[PDB]
Amino acid sequence: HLMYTLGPDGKRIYTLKKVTESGEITKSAHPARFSPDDKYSRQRVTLKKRFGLVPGQ
Structure with missing residues (x-):
């Protein structure tokens, strides 16, 4: 019925x-x-x- 998991030392942990x-x-x-x-x-x-023009005669 607990809404939190305890640790190896007894620390509460909200993990529903x-x-x-x-x-x-x-x-x-x-x-x-x-x-x-x-x-x-x-x-x-x-x-x-490219402007490849060929100006000339």
Whole structure:
């Protein structure tokens, strides 16, 4: 009928453990990274950044 477990010396320890699990359930459907396609990258959209021109005659 005790609501606490004693130690090897006689020290009381509140360990009713009435409930099975004792933890805060994390929220589901968390915000996952957005990336449905490869075009998502701003770099892919940006024009050629190589500037490989050939000025001359």
